[PDB]
Amino acid sequence: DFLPLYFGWFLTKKSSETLRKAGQVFLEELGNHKAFKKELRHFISGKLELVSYFGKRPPGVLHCTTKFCDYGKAAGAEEYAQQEVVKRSYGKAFKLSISALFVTPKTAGAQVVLTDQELQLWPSDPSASEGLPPGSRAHVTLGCAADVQPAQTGLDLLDILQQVKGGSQGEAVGELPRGKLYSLGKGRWMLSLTKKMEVKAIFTGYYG
Numbered sequence: 001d002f003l004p005l006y007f008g009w010f011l012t013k014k015s016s017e018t019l020r021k022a023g024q025v026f027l028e029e030l031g032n033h034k035a036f037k038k039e040l041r042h043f044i045s046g047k048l049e050l051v052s053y054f055g056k057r058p059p060g061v062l063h064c065t066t067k068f069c070d071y072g073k074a075a076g077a078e079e080y081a082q083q084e085v086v087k088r089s090y091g092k093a094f095k096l097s098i099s100a101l102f103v104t105p106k107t108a109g110a111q112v113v114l115t116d117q118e119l120q121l122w123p124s125d126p127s128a129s130e131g132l133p134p135g136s137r138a139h140v141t142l143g144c145a146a147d148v149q150p151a152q153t154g155l156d157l158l159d160i161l162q163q164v165k166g167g168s169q170g171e172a173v174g175e176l177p178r179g180k181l182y183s184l185g186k187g188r189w190m191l192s193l194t195k196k197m198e199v200k201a202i203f204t205g206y207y208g
């Protein structure tokens, strides 16, 4: 039997709507914020409406990917699929904790903090991940720029989590209704939610 395109936690319709709108509000507020406007030259090289900037968005249900498999063509795919914990967890319900919303010149996303139980489902094959605890890459993609490729959001999140690793977040340059707004430079932005969002999701496989 051939594997799916990827395994992951697929949010319920309820949660998807909640997270998508939250993400949407973040883009609208961020783009309207003075601290962001005066940094536009570090974001693009040419007022920017971020909702349109991130034109490529998930068509429907949002998800948090664990392992990209490419129907078995991806390295370590077969080995990930064969694990008991994956076959056992298939179809099960989980609660994912969203800790922050972030934006870079390439992607917009939400940071997921996995529990130890959920970390069991994280693959164990990057230089970015160096220093950060496994699963730091976990995320939900909300949108990307026109010519941005898959897997970029995870790479973007890791990079941001490296800046914070060196206590270089800088003071919050503003307050939004949901939390503190941080400017990380090079077009990178992070909203650390005051209260973590919880989303219900089902762990399963997507076959395209």
Ligand SMILES: Nc1ncnc2c1ncn2[C@@H]1O[C@H](CO)[C@@H](O)[C@H]1OP(=O)(O)S
Residues within 6 Å of the ligand: 006, 065, 067, 068, 140, 141, 149, 150, 151, 152, 153, 154
């Ligand atoms: N190496 C990869 N190549 C393509 N997609 C990947 C890869 N790693 C993780 N993904 C993810 O698999 C899903 C389908 O592309 C998407 O969720 C990709 O992740 P994102 O960072 O959200 S674009």
